[PDB]
Amino acid sequence: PPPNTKPINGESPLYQCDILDKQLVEIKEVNLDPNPPVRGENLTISANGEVFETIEEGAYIDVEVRLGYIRLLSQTFDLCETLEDNDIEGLSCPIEPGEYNIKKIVEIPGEVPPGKYVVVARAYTEKDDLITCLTGEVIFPPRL
Ligand SMILES: CC(C)[C@@H](C)/C=C/[C@@H](C)[C@H]1CC[C@H]2C3=CC=C4C[C@@H](O)CC[C@]4(C)[C@H]3CC[C@]12C
Ligand SMILES: *[C@@H]1O[C@H](CO)[C@@H](O)[C@H](O)[C@H]1NC(C)=O
């Protein structure tokens, strides 16, 4: 994978990107229950990380999904509102420094077209300090 990248330990395709930029959160480990995610099935996400600065209301995530060279989805999300909506282990947004472990189950839709998808997410704080940068490639087998 590209420059300024480091693999994330665990059963996952994720890499940390922009590694030469200090990040307020370290993602130490990530594990996916069906290791290559499968369409139409549950996906269990387990993650171990560290928070070095309090993340406050107003943080946001830039998420980009790309299919080949096509910019499929590109938008920003309210970090706190998004975490609060998806019930990630009751984590209220004021995320204090410390040791975290997360377990979340999401559903991968079966209608997703087959292909090589690349995901990139950058989370920043309200004054725009880089929280973290993650990238990953997921190939869904061509049975449409
Ligand atoms: C952790 C990552 C690497 C794993 C889970 C893979 C990402 C999946 C879930 C991503 C890859 C492409 C994404 C994707 C492609 C196309 C569409 C159609 C659009 O109208 C709504 C979003 C939607 C439905 C999203 C849903 C989430 C998908 C299917
Ligand atoms: C998928 O997840 C839903 C809710 O998380 C659960 O009710 C269902 O039993 C799960 N099914 C499988 C096959 O894991």
From Swiss-Prot:
Domain of life: Eukaryota
GO MF term list: phosphatidylcholine binding; phosphatidylinositol binding; phosphatidylserine binding; sterol binding
A single BP term in Gene Ontology: sterol transport
Localization: Vacuole
Keyword Magnesium appears in the UniProt entry: no
GO cellular component annotations of the record: fungal-type vacuole; fungal-type vacuole lumen
Keyword Glycoprotein: no
Other information: Present with 2836 molecules/cell in log phase SD medium.
Record family assignment: Belongs to the NPC2 family.
Summary of subunit composition and partner proteins: Monomer.
The name this protein goes by in its record: Phosphatidylglycerol/phosphatidylinositol transfer protein
The species this protein was found in: Saccharomyces cerevisiae (strain ATCC 204508 / S288c) (Baker's yeast)
Residues of the full protein shown: 31 to 173 of 173
